[PDB]
Design a protein around this ligand. Structure first.
Ligand SMILES: *[C@@H]1O[C@H](CO)[C@@H](O[C@@H]2O[C@H](CO)[C@@H](O[C@@H]3O[C@H](CO)[C@@H](O)[C@H](O)[C@@H]3O)[C@H](O)[C@H]2NC(C)=O)[C@H](O)[C@H]1NC(C)=O
Ligand SMILES: *[C@@H]1O[C@H](CO)[C@@H](O[C@@H]2O[C@H](CO)[C@@H](O)[C@H](O)[C@H]2NC(C)=O)[C@H](O)[C@H]1NC(C)=O
Ligand SMILES: *[C@@H]1O[C@H](CO)[C@@H](O)[C@H](O)[C@H]1NC(C)=O
Ligand SMILES: *[C@@H]1O[C@H](CO)[C@@H](O)[C@H](O)[C@H]1NC(C)=O
Ligand SMILES: *[C@@H]1O[C@H](CO)[C@@H](O)[C@H](O)[C@H]1NC(C)=O
Ligand SMILES: *[C@@H]1O[C@H](CO)[C@@H](O)[C@H](O)[C@H]1NC(C)=O
Ligand SMILES: *[C@@H]1O[C@H](CO)[C@@H](O)[C@H](O)[C@H]1NC(C)=O
Ligand SMILES: *[C@@H]1O[C@H](CO)[C@@H](O)[C@H](O)[C@H]1NC(C)=O
Ligand SMILES: *[C@@H]1O[C@H](CO)[C@@H](O)[C@H](O)[C@H]1NC(C)=O
Ligand SMILES: *[C@@H]1O[C@H](CO)[C@@H](O)[C@H](O)[C@H]1NC(C)=O
Lengths: 600, 309, 176
């Protein structure tokens, strides 16, 4: 008995029984039942307008001619003669050779076709079982999203990723596959890896109410950030005289800057999304650099060199993006731009986020240095930025953005529209970049007028207030728990009872009503069969005031059993019979006979 | 004499604990074999072991025995141990003192199968059978016998002739009454009498607290929260961080499960000892030295306690 | 668990070796080794715990055989439900089966009892029986099987006079 997860057709799903362009949702199921031979083939592709390589399939009488060509139309837009079709141009790949069932699957550039031609007796829809064998696997490797039937009484279904339990026969033939998400019983069957279940309690997957909406709440401050002005500054200072530029209280919409300049050195070390707009971070600390060509490699965490030891050093734990672009026509001079200087000598080493300001002559000799003369060199060299230099020596313009991402008790967020707050509802929240799920209620917490978040003994966020409303609210999570299944055995019957452990019956009923529970299968939930007990909510049976011996233990003194009008019943466990001994001042019972009993 | 009998039944959801409802984390966890299945099986085994422990300890009686309305037993008091109808749950005053003296992220505590009222009912039935039918009800059908005659038989059981009891019945009854009275004061004034049960509760609480607290450890990753890492990098880079967090949390779960298994084995041994004591010390007179008390044993009375007897 | 990738390229060493460079192959092999070693450690720990449990069970079985089979035990509900008589072991695969033979009384009968008997102005107590009456006549009998006997001096012993025992009852003790 093999349990496998793959794309399958869900049991008892809606099937459209019939030329529209049906979308190819990563797997389709085709079943045609005719004797007029009207169905002849199929076409596949994305646009199918003679631009991409459209897949062509045709079955004339016995063999399926498979071609990958570029055609506007086929024979399909009193059946006496037809062999002209419409187009078969630009064929880049070639192949040759009742109840016709077909499954078409495409994955990793492989076209898989599963066929099964079972001549069922009659023409009624068969309420039976029949597996499909792999006909051919074509590695043509093309994109397919839409398909149409070809003509000269069929069903179409879409495949979904499910988990199935398959029973292989001694001669390895699949018989009587069972689903794993249809019925509560056909979940315990998958769990136990068997087709027969015994009478008793059985644990299974967990239930969890899903979020309903998603709300994003950011404080209004719509000033755009002066990123472009920093980027489009006319002149940058020396590499050792790098300009720190703090940016705050604005909108960090720098995604537009991707197009203004043709970035060639765009590396992000700590955080690298292409869509870096949902990130809220405190400090940005923009920096301005002017370096040569073969120097951008030195701008990296854990990198050493002349620049790292004398001019500028990056910390090892750097979280930011490094951006550089060519500056030949704006940072060069014909006679040499003798204005950009860099530190070259120093009797010490630099540390991250430090700047050098002293310009005294470096002491390169044992004797004390006073002016030039002996071996004393000025620790400043002017760059000879000429336009005739090579790529490795051409000056470059570099900007360093150092982020500090630790929650968000501060400003500087990307562009994102706000959304109205919702109270008393299991809704995704994005309060100022703090993301999670839960139910938000009114909080009586006395927050001092500087505290933003709030933790608990386990250090989990339990309270938050948004600046746009300045109202404190707690973050109690959405309900969840484990569910159990009650069955009286496969031999006896098939009725089952489910127990949602540790949840209120009203809450689970509300979640069932507005289609909010993850275990999409639903018990019928009739009247007077929803019982509430300390163990949980038991919607599978009715409660009876009679007392019996325990059969299937549930908990808190409640046991379930199958009685006969056959149905499952829940009752309070009985502790045996009752017998009061007739104690008296003068009365003794003496046995008059015995029994020899043997026990194992 | 106090003996632990049971432990809190806990069930842990492996997927929710390791992965905070993230599909990408679940896909990576899926390649780590059947670890979560093993953990769930071990926890279920522990829970059913606890249920069997309490079932074996307290359900040794066949039929529920009811004491007669009039409660004269030749001067013996038997008030602090018999249930008092003038209160809910029908618990004896000593049981009342015992109960009044003692006292999130995928973790669930399952309630015990037998409620405390059922345990109290078993205790009352056992005590009534002991005081009415003597020790005969444990070896077959219950046979009525006056209490002074049962006490005379028990005196004969330790090499003392029965005339002593009929000679000093009043003195012996007064001595027993005073001794049973002093127990209430001993358990009231002294606050640490029930040390072992509270120790078990504290151990379980500490284990749970450590398990929940270790969810905040980075384990050498960017952050301790999955969702932030997911919405911070492309999946290929975030995979390493997800894997590190998964390994750390899985190790934490394995350690917790192993510790719970060892504690469950210890409590199983204690429950077997308690069941043996109830079978021998209560349902009869034991000649084993220093087993049913300190001295020549006469009789015993059980009293229900939270996760113990 | 040998077929689990454990977050690697594959689950077969040969493909990993003959698919990549030595460094990445070494990393993949290290991951696989860690996973498989953890699997072995878990299996060994489980085996140790089960071995301890079975050791306790075997000690209990040895005690039962030493006390219930090789002699008669007076412990209550240790060698069976009821008064123990004997036991017989039977070999079983990876275990043992005990056949406990017990004595169980039945067919109760009600009687009126008295703590003592006062014949010659002196209290009398049964030597090992229980004083019972069938309404008119008084007898002494065993406390586990009804067998009335005529009360006599050789059947009782005298201790004190007739003013201390609460439930003392007039009767006649016939001397032989
Ligand atoms: C280097 O970093 C400093 C510190 O962040 C920058 O400081 C100030 O930046 C503004 C905007 O570029 C400059 O312009 C002035 O802004 C004020 C804003 O209220 C405005 O009122 C003025 O009319 C003017 O537009 C400002 O001069 C500048 N101050 C100083 C002392 O430099 C600076 O711009 C950065 N420059 C670079 C990249 O070299
Ligand atoms: C048995 O013991 C109880 C417990 O002390 C006795 O109840 C006491 O009775 C006296 C006399 O009325 C009261 O002053 C006390 O307050 C009672 N104690 C409690 C705790 O209520 C009882 O008298 C004893 N004898 C019998 C036959 O029950
Ligand atoms: C399996 O193969 C054997 C040998 O060919 C055949 O006798 C048998 O009928 C086949 N099918 C089943 C269901 O046993
Ligand atoms: C801007 O924010 C302030 C403070 O939160 C608030 O009072 C004001 O209504 C907001 N304005 C708009 C247009 O949202
Ligand atoms: C379920 O909710 C209702 C009202 O919301 C409440 O009266 C009831 O006590 C709740 N159930 C439990 C077990 O507390
Ligand atoms: C037993 O004797 C006592 C003596 O105080 C008496 O109160 C009680 O009613 C008697 N029991 C009976 C007659 O059942
Ligand atoms: C005791 O009971 C048995 C039934 O098991 C019966 O055959 C026998 O006659 C009884 N003894 C007497 C003395 O009647
Ligand atoms: C006590 O004896 C009477 C008659 O002697 C009888 O009716 C009654 O059932 C007996 N009590 C028992 C057997 O508990
Ligand atoms: C009691 O036992 C005596 C013993 O001889 C017998 O004669 C008598 O009939 C029995 N029954 C009664 C009611 O005395
Ligand atoms: C027992 O005999 C004594 C002495 O004759 C007498 O005083 C007493 O009343 C008798 N008791 C009964 C219950 O007949």
């Amino acid at each position: 008995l093999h349990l496998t997860q793959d794309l399958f057709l869900p049991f008892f799903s809606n099937v459209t029984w019939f030329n529209p362009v049906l979308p190819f949702n990563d797997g389709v199921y085709f079943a045609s039942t005719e004797k007029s031979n009207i169905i002849r083939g199929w076409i596949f592709g994305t646009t199918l307008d003679s631009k991409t390589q459209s897949l062509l399939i045709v079955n004339n009488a016995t063999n399926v001619f498979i071609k990958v060509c570029e055609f506007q139309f086929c024979n399909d837009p009193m059946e006496s003669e037809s062999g002209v079709y419409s187009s078969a141009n630009n064929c880049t790949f070639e192949y040759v050779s009742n109840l016709r069932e077909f499954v078409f699957k495409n994955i990793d550039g492989y076209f898989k076709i599963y066929s099964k031609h079972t001549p069922i007796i009659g023409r009624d829809f068969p309420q039976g079982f029949s597996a499909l064998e792999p006909l051919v696997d074509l590695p043509i490797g093309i994109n397919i999203t839409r398909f149409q039937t070809l003509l000269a009484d069929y069903y179409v279904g879409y495949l979904q990723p499910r988990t199935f339990l398959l029973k292989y026969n001694e001669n390895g033939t699949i018989t009587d596959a069972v689903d794993c998400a249809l019925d509560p019983l056909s979940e315990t069957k998958c769990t136990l890896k068997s087709f027969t279940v015994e009478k008793g309690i059985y644990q299974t997957s967990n239930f969890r109410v899903q979020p309903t909406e998603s709300i994003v709440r950011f404080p209004n401050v719509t000033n755009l950030c002066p990123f472009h002005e920093v980027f489009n500054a006319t002149r940058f200072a020396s590499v050792y005289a790098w300009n720190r530029t703090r940016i705050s209280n604005c909108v960090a919409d720098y995604s537009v800057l991707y197009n203004f300049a043709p970035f060639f050195a765009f590396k992000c070390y700590g955080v690298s999304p292409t869509k870096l707009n949902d990130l809220c971070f405190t400090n940005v600390y923009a920096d301005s650099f002017v370096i040569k060509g073969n120097e951008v490699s030195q701008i990296a965490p854990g990198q050493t060199g002349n620049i790292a030891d004398y001019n500028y050093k990056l910390p090892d734990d750097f979280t930011g993006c490094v951006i550089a672009w060519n500056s030949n026509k704006l940072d060069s001079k014909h006679s040499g731009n003798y204005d950009y200087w860099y530190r070259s000598f120093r009797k010490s080493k630099l540390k991250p986020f430090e700047r050098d300001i002293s310009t005294e002559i470096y002491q390169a000799g044992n004797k004390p240095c006073k002016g030039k003369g002996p071996n004393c060199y000025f620790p400043l060299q002017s760059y000879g930025f000429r336009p005739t230099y090579g790529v490795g020596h051409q000056p470059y313009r570099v900007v360093v953005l150092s982020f500090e991402l630790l929650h968000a008790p501060a400003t500087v967020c990307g562009p994102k529209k706000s959304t109205n707050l919702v109270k008393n509802k299991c809704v995704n929240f994005n309060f100022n970049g703090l993301t999670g799920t839960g139910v938000l209620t009114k909080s009586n917490k006395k927050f001092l007028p500087f505290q933003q978040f709030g933790r608990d003994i386990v250090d989990t966020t339990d309270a938050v207030r948004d600046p746009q409303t300045l109202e404190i609210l707690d973050i109690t999570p959405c309900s969840f728990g484990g569910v159990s299944v009650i069955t009286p055995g496969t031999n006896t019957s098939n009725q089952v009872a489910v127990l949602y452990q540790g949840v209120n019956c009203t809450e689970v009923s509300v979640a069932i009503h507005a289609d909010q529970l993850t275990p999409t299968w639903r018990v019928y939930s009739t009247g007077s069969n929803v019982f509430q007990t300390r163990a949980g909510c038991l919607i599978g049976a009715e409660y009876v005031n009679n007392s019996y011996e325990c059969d299937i233990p549930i908990g808190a003194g409640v046991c379930a059993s199958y009685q006969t009008s056959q149905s499952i019943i829940a009752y309070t466990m009985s502790l045996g019979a009752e017998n009061s001994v007739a104690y008296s001042n003068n009365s003794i019972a003496i046995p008059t006979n015995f029994t020899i009993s043997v026990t194992t | 004499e106090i003996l632990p009998v049971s432990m809190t039944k806990t069930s842990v959801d492996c997927t929710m604990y390791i992965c905070g409802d993230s599909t990408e984390c679940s896909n990576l966890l899926l390649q780590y074999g059947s670890f979560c299945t093993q953990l769930k099986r071990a926890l279920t085994g522990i829970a059913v072991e606890q249920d069997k422990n309490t079932q074996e300890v307290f359900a040794q009686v066949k039929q529920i025995y009811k004491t007669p309305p009039i409660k004269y037993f030749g001067g013996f008091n038997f008030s602090q141990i018999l249930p008092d109808p003038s209160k809910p749950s029908k618990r004896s005053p000593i049981e009342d003192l015992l109960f009044n003296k003692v006292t999130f992220n995928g973790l669930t505590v399952l309630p015990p199968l037998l409620t405390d009222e059922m345990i109290a009912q078993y205790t009352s039935a056992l005590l009534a059978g002991t005081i009415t039918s003597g020790w005969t009800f444990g070896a077959g059908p219950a046979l009525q016998i006056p209490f002074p005659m049962q006490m005379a038989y028990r005196f004969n059981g330790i090499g003392v002739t029965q005339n002593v009891l009929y000679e000093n019945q009043k003195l012996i009854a007064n001595q027993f009454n005073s001794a049973i009275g002093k127990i209430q004061d001993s358990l009231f004034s002294t606050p640490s009498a029930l040390g072992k049960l509270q120790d078990v509760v504290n151990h379980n609480a500490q284990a749970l607290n450590t398990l929940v607290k270790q969810l905040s450890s980075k384990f050498g990753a960017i952050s301790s929260v999955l969702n932030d890492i997911l919405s911070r990098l492309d999946p290929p880079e975030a995979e390493v961080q997800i894997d590190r967090l998964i390994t750390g949390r899985l190790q934490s779960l394995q350690t917790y499960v192993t510790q719970q298994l060892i504690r469950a084995a210890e409590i199983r041994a204690s429950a077997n000892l308690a069941a043996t004591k109830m079978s021998e010390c209560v349902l009869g007179q034991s000649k084993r030295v220093d087993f049913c008390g300190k001295g020549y044993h006469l009789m015993s009375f059980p009293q229900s306690a939270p996760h113990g007897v | 668990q040998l077929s689990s990738k454990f977050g690697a390229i594959s689950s077969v060493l040969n493909d990993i070796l003959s698919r990549l460079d030595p460094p990445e192959a070494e990393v993949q092999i290290d991951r696989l080794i860690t996973g498989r070693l953890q699997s072995l450690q878990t299996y060994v720990t489980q085996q140790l715990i089960r071995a301890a449990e079975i050791r306790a069970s075997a000690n209990l079985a040895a005690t039962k055989m030493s006390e219930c089979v090789l002699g008669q035990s007076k412990r209550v509900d240790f060698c069976g439900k009821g008064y123990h008589l004997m036991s017989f072991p039977q070999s079983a695969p990876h275990g043992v089966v005990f056949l406990h033979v017990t004595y169980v009384p039945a067919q109760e009968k009600n009687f009126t009892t008295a703590p003592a008997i006062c014949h010659d102005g002196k209290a009398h107590f049964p030597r090992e029986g229980v004083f019972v009456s069938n309404g008119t006549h008084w007898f002494v009998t065993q406390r586990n099987f009804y067998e009335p006997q005529i009360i006599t001096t050789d059947n009782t012993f005298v201790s004190g006079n007739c003013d201390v025992v609460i439930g003392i009852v007039n009767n006649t003790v016939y001397d032989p």
